Design a protein around this ligand. Structure first.
Ligand SMILES: CCc1sc2ncnc(N[C@H](Cc3ccccc3)C(=O)O)c2c1-c1cccc(Cl)c1C
Ligand SMILES: [Mg+2]
Length: 151
């Protein structure tokens, strides 16, 4: 892991999904550019919470269709995310939608007592994001670009 973008992405996305599922903020320290990661996480909270509230019926509809019951079902979610996310256009709107839906699924995992699947889902979403949109993210200045875009 000589890959700061992946590490920083995994930290932000893992922390968001964990706090959304449990309702508790994580007090573990951030790594390297914590100042950016902290601002990105605060942005994700405002915009990601907005997406889940505004599009609740759509998210509930997709969740019902995916019938998530365990680690096996979370693994096939990953494959749907590459098809849906990777085959469409790239912008922070779609990236926030992917992560927001991750957080929605994370709350479901906590509701069905499968908390152990939240960290793997976060890894899977981070993999989709950084593996498929690497050059776009670097061109946009990564999570610094994310913070700046949402003011
Ligand atoms: C597999 C679920 C995913 S992953 C993903 N990543 C990026 N964008 C997505 N959907 C938007 C359309 C949309 C925006 C807001 C709310 C609902 C849909 C896109 O493709 O541009 C999606 C959807 C996805 C795709 C279709 C429906 C639903 Cl509910 C989701 C969560
Ligand atoms: Mg919007």
């Amino acid at each position: 892991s000589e890959d700061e973008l992946y590490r920083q992405s995994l930290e932000i996305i893992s922390r968001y999904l964990r706090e959304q599922a449990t309702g508790a903020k994580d007090t573990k320290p951030m790594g390297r550019s914590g100042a950016t990661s902290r601002k990105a996480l605060e942005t994700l909270r405002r915009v990601g919470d907005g997406v889940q509230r505004n599009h609740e019926t759509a998210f509930q509809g997709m969740l019902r269709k995916l019938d998530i019951k365990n680690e096996d079902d979370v693994k096939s979610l990953s494959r749907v995310m590459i098809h849906v996310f990777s085959d469409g256009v790239t912008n922070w709107g779609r990236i926030v939608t992917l992560i927001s839906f991750g957080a929605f699924v994370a709350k479901h995992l906590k509701t069905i007592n499968q908390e152990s699947c939240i960290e793997p889902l976060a890894e899977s979403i981070t993999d989709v994001l950084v593996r498929t949109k690497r050059d776009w993210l670097v061109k946009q200045r990564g999570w610094d670009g994310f913070v700046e875009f949402f003011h």
